[PDB]
Design a protein around this ligand. Sequence first.
Ligand SMILES: Cc1cc2nc3c(=O)[nH]c(=O)nc-3n(C[C@H](O)[C@H](O)[C@H](O)COP(=O)(O)O)c2cc1C
Ligand SMILES: Cc1cc2nc3c(=O)[nH]c(=O)nc-3n(C[C@H](O)[C@H](O)[C@H](O)COP(=O)(O)O)c2cc1C
Lengths: 105, 106
Amino acid sequence: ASGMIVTDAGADQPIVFVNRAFSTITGYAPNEVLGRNARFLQGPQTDAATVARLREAIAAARPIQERILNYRKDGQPFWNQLSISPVRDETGNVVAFVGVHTDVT
Amino acid sequence: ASGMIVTDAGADQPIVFVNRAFSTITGYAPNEVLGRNARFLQGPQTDAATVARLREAIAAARPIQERILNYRKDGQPFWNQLSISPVRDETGNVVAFVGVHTDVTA
Ligand SMILES: Cc1cc2nc3c(=O)[nH]c(=O)nc-3n(C[C@H](O)[C@H](O)[C@H](O)COP(=O)(O)O)c2cc1C
Ligand SMILES: Cc1cc2nc3c(=O)[nH]c(=O)nc-3n(C[C@H](O)[C@H](O)[C@H](O)COP(=O)(O)O)c2cc1C
């Protein structure tokens, strides 16, 4: 099953919602991630260039997909196939971001 | 501000998340809507042909935009500029639906 992360659009894109599969994949319960930026999933072997592409895409509200090394709550690394898209209203304002992720280890 | 509704993909699309603007626009608190299909926003002056287009688009997981007459919790009508899109994983599976809505009553 594919995880889903919804964040606010501004400040530092705090997580406001995760689905069941997010917890299955990452080992984190919703209560311990809500209000945090999803970058806590990253760790020592995460590719910095991949992180920088995500950072630029979110800043510009551009859709992006990456395969990124993430870490479960218990510290185990896994390959996360991640897609992020902005959610926009009719006037083009960004309301939220939505991420979908799949463990492709 | 623009409301956002997230629903499950399956089983008549129950609401799983709303943002604060959803409550400002509709008068419903999250507790009052979680687990329900968003059609409780409709009422007797809602255009049946618009509802049909929504029904067919959601069943097909096709993005759709419509202006639809909706009703606040206490019954006040408002025009809802609504856009609904599926959320897909890399294999194309629909994970959720996301709706963004604005009160465009003149
Ligand atoms: C909706 C959404 C979902 C995200 N999901 C993930 C994720 O699953 N894994 C990850 O490493 N980063 C994820 N990110 C990216 C980080 O939150 C952050 O944007 C990224 O690391 C770049 O920013 P930084 O350089 O400030 O950390 C997500 C971001 C958004 C907006
Ligand atoms: C994510 C999402 C958000 C929705 N938001 C609204 C809304 O704001 N107003 C509305 O009248 N219907 C909304 N709907 C549409 C109804 O939930 C429903 O799909 C539509 O009325 C057609 O179905 P029916 O004939 O089975 O009621 C939304 C649906 C989804 C999936």
